C-alpha cells in the first residue's frame, strides 16, 4: 500500500532503497520534527516499490512517503 | 546496588560494557518507561542532524525511555529537559554550563555535552552524551578537563538521573516551566548568521513557547528559527 507521514516535518534521511525487502516495524525514513528525529516504521513486510520524498523535503501530515509492493 | 531513589527515570538501568548506540537499543527493545540504557563506550554514537558522536570510555553515554503522553506542541521541550538536567548536574560539580540552542551544553564555549531525542511510535528516547573523564574532539571539553582531575563517573550518573527524574515529573505537572529554565540558562545576546534561502543576520535573543529561536535583525525585525530547517553559525 502506502506509508504516509504521521506528522509534519523535514526528511532527515531515507533508510531504504527501491526494491529492498522490509519487515513490519522497520524504519523507512527519518523525519526531523519538534526537536526530535522521528523514524517512520513500515506497517507491514514487503518490498519498496517507490520512494516519494527526498532528503531535505518538508512534508505534512498524511503525505505519501513510501510505496510498498 | 546503584541506590537510586527516583520515581520513574532510573527505576531500572541496563548497563553494557560496549554497544553501537544506547539510543538504538532503547528504540528497538521493549522497555518500561524510565528505563536507562548506559554503556562504557559506544562505537556508533548518534549525533543530531545526521552527525556522529564520539563516545570513548570515561564519559557518560545514556538513553532514557519516556512516555510523556503530551500534545505535539509540548514535544519540542523534551530535548530541553535533557539539556537542563546536564546544566544542573554540572552546577553541583561547580561547573558553569550554558545551553547552545537547542541541544548542546557549553562551558567557556566548548561543547561538554549533547542531547538527541528520537521517536518511533508512542516511544520517545532521550539520549544524552556527557564528556566526563574521556578524551574529547578538538574544541570540546570535559568535566575532568574543567576540574583538573578525574571525576567519579557513577556519582555524575546518579546526579544526572536524579535531576532528570525531578525535571520530568515537573514537566508532567506543568510542561511550561522547562521553557523558563532554558531561557535563564542559554547563551543569549550573541550575533548569529542564518544560511540557506533567505539568508540573514541578527542577535539570538530568546526562544518562543515552541522552542523556536528568536532572532533580532539590525532592522528591528523579528524572525524565528526552526531547528533542522536552516543552518546557524556564530559570528
Ligand atoms: N564527545 C563529544 N564531545 C563534544 N563534541 C563532540 C563529541 N563527539 C562529536 N562531537 C562534535 O560533533 C562533530 C562530529 O559530528 C564534531 O565537529 C565534534 O565537535
Ligand atoms: O549534540 C549532539 O549532536 C547530540 C549527541 C547525543 C549523544 C548521545 S550519547 C547517548 C545516546 N546514544 C547515541 O547514539 N546518541 C546519544
Ligand atoms: C523548534 O525547532 C521548533 C519546532 C517547530 C514548531 C513549529 S510550530 C509551527 C509548526 N507546526 C508544527 O506542528 N511544528 C512547527
UniProtKB/TrEMBL annotation, chain A:
Segment forming the signal sequence: none
Residue ranges annotated for the Lipoyl-binding domain, each copy included: 1-69
Record protein name field: 149aa long hypothetical methylmalonyl-CoA decarboxylase gamma chain
Residues of the full protein shown: 81 to 149 of 149
UniProtKB/TrEMBL annotation, chain B:
Alphabetical UniProt keywords: ATP-binding, Ligase, Metal-binding, Nucleotide-binding
Binding residues for Mn(2+): 103-104
GO MF terms, alphabetically ordered: ATP binding; biotin--[biotin carboxyl-carrier protein] ligase activity; metal ion binding
Residues that bind biotin: 21-23, 42, 46, 48, 51, 103, 111, 115
Residues engaged in binding ADP 2: 51, 54, 131
SUPFAM superfamilies for this protein: C-terminal domain of transcriptional repressors, Class II aaRS and biotin synthetases
PROSITE patterns to which the protein is assigned, alphabetical: BPL_LPL_CATALYTIC
Keyword Chaperone: no
UniProt xrefs under PANTHER family: BIOTIN PROTEIN LIGASE (PTHR12835), BIOTIN--PROTEIN LIGASE (PTHR12835:SF5)
Record protein name field: 235aa long hypothetical biotin--[acetyl-CoA-carboxylase] ligase
Species, as recorded: Pyrococcus horikoshii (strain ATCC 700860 / DSM 12428 / JCM 9974 / NBRC 100139 / OT-3)
Amino acid at each position: 500500500n502506502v506509508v504516509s507521514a504521521p506528522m509534519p516535518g523535514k526528511v532527515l534521511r531515507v533508510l531504504v532503497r527501491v526494491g529492498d525487502r522490509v519487515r513490519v516495524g522497520q524504519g523507512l525514513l527519518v523525519l526531523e520534527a519538534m526537536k526530535m528525529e522521528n523514524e517512520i516504521p513500515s506497517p507491514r513486510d514487503g518490498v519498496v516499490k517507490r520512494i516519494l520524498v527526498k532528503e531535505g523535503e518538508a512534508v505534512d501530515t498524511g503525505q505519501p512517503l513510501i510505496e510498498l509492493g | 546496588m546503584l541506590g537510586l531513589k527516583t520515581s520513574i527515570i532510573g527505576r531500572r538501568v541496563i548497563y553494557f560494557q560496549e554497544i553501537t548506540s544506547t539510543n538504538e537499543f532503547a528504540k528497538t527493545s521493549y522497555l518500561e518507561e524510565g528505563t536507562v540504557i548506559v554503556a562504557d563506550k559506544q562505537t556508533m554514537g548518534h549525533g543530531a542532524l545526521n552527525r556522529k558522536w564520539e563516545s570513548p570510555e570515561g564519559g557518560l553515554w545514556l538513553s532514557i525511555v519516556l512516555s510523556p503522553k503530551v500534545p505535539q506542541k509540548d514535544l519540542p521541550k523534551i530535548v530541553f529537559l535533557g539539556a537542563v538536567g546536564v546544566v544542573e548536574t554540572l552546577k553541583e560539580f561547580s561547573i558553569d554550563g550554558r545551553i547552545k540552542w537547542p541541544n548542546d551544553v557549553l562551558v567557556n564555549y566548548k561543547a561538554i555535552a549533547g542531547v538527541l531525542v528520537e521517536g518511533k511510535g508512542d516511544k520517545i528516547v532521550l539520549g544524552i552524551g556527557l564528556n566526563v573523564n574521556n578524551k574529547v574532539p578538538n574544541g570540546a571539553t570535559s568535566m575532568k578537563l574543567e576540574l583538573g582531575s578525574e571525576v567519579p563517573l557513577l556519582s555524575v550518573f546518579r546526579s544526572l538521573i536524579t535531576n532528570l527524574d525531578r525535571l520530568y515529573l515537573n514537566f508532567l505537572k506543568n510542561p511550561m516551566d522547562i521553557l523558563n529554565l532554558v531561557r535563564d540558562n542559554m547563551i543569549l545576546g550573541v550575533r548569529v548568521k542564518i544560511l540557506g534561502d533567505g539568508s540573514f543576520e541578527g542577535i539570538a535573543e530568546d526562544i518562543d513557547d515552541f522552542g523556536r529561536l528568536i532572532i533580532r535583525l539590525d532592522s528591528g525585525e523579528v524572525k524565528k528559527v526552526i531547528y533542522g530547517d536552516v543552518s546557524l553559525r556564530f559570528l
